[PDB]
Design a protein around this ligand. Structure first.
Ligand SMILES: Nc1ncnc2c1ncn2[C@@H]1O[C@H](COP(=O)(O)OP(=O)(O)O)[C@@H](O)[C@H]1O
Ligand SMILES: [Mg+2]
Ligand SMILES: [Mg+2]
Ligand SMILES: [Mg+2]
Length: 302
């Protein structure tokens, strides 16, 4: 009894994750959540049973390695190399190809994509020999959480390629009924929620369309409902989530799923993010508290 969890998170992540309910509920289960001062060497604090973190930069990486060398039995959530795979959008999706699950009901994968590094490479673009076709979507290569990294481009024809801002991933746009399925994972716990997405390109006035996250009224529109969109099968979502947990080596992540409406039963993972916002997930205090108990009780048992 009485495990300690040191946490190193940005101030806005502390405000949303470290709530009173979470602190107090973990404390009665015996989990002591302790704030890491990142302005002081990690190795000079604690020691902690577990280090939970979401910090950028090589020096934090240096400090984790330093810390884990002196306390090789402390659990690190999560491994910095595992987190780091999610920072380049090519390497981000590589784990999907390693997930092996029995599910002949439906297939899964990632959309076709190619990388455009600079201006010269835009000029050399040939979608055809890559098996790409227009409707493509250009995504910044680096997923660093900056505003820039979310600024995206829909390209409808040859012109509009001129609006690419490399380094970019060039990815086929998949008609998916205008709804993403965001799957949240905490260890073996799996929750899914629908969210609005881009409309289908009905195979207009522009050869490109930039869009982001912030993408008023007075212009008439009826907001489409997502009720009638079918969820992917529950068994498939949770088996893929737990396969991904095992391949990425990440305990806390979400991934975005779209259904490829061209086929019926093909699902594509288009995004995987480390340690997303959990504070409005129902019951998140008990789910996160039980997760810490489970992983600390597993690790303490070894
Ligand atoms: N291959 C694709 N086909 C169709 N829509 C896509 C595709 N990739 C991304 N999108 C749309 O763009 C949005 C952002 O893409 P995503 O890869 O999730 O970026 P971010 O990391 O900024 O969330 C998605 O929520 C989805 O609506
Ligand atoms: Mg400090
Ligand atoms: Mg996303
Ligand atoms: Mg993302």
């Amino acid at each position: 009894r009485r495990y300690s969890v040191g946490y190193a998170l940005a101030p806005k992540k502390q405000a949303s994750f470290i709530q009173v309910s979470l602190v107090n509920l973990a404390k009665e289960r015996g989990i002591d959540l302790i704030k890491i001062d990142t302005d002081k060497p990690l190795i000079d604090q604690g020691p902690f049973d577990c280090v939970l973190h979401k910090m950028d930069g090589d020096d934090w990486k240096r400090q984790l390695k330093e810390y884990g060398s002196e306390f090789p039995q402390a659990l690190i959530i999560d491994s910095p190399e595992a987190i780091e795979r999610l920072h380049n959008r090519i390497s981000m999706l590589q784990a999907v190809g390693e997930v092996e699950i029995d599910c002949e009901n439906a297939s899964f994968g990632i959309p076709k994509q190619t990388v455009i590094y600079d201006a010269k490479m835009v000029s050399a673009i040939n979608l055809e020999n890559e098996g790409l076709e227009f409707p493509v979507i250009a995504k910044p290569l680096v997923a660093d959480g900056s505003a820039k990294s979310h600024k995206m481009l829909l390209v409808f024809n040859k012109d509009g390629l001129r609006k690419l801002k490399p380094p970019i991933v060039l990815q086929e746009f998949v008609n998916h009924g205008a709804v993403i399925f965001k799957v949240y994972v905490v260890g073996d716990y799996v929750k899914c929620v629908k969210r609005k997405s881009l409309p289908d390109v009905k195979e207009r006035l522009e050869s490109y369309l930039p869009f982001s996250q912030v993408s008023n009224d007075d212009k008439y529109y009826k907001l489409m409902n997502l009720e009638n969109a079918e969820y992917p099968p529950l068994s498939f979502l949770t088996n893929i989530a737990r396969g991904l947990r095992r391949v990425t080596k990440l305990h806390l992540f979400n991934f975005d799923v779209i259904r490829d409406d061209r086929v019926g039963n093909r699902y594509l993972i288009i995004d995987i993010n480390y340690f997303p916002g959990y504070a409005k997930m129902p019951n998140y205090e008990r789910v996160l508290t039980d997760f810490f108990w489970d992983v600390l009780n597993q690790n303490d048992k070894s």
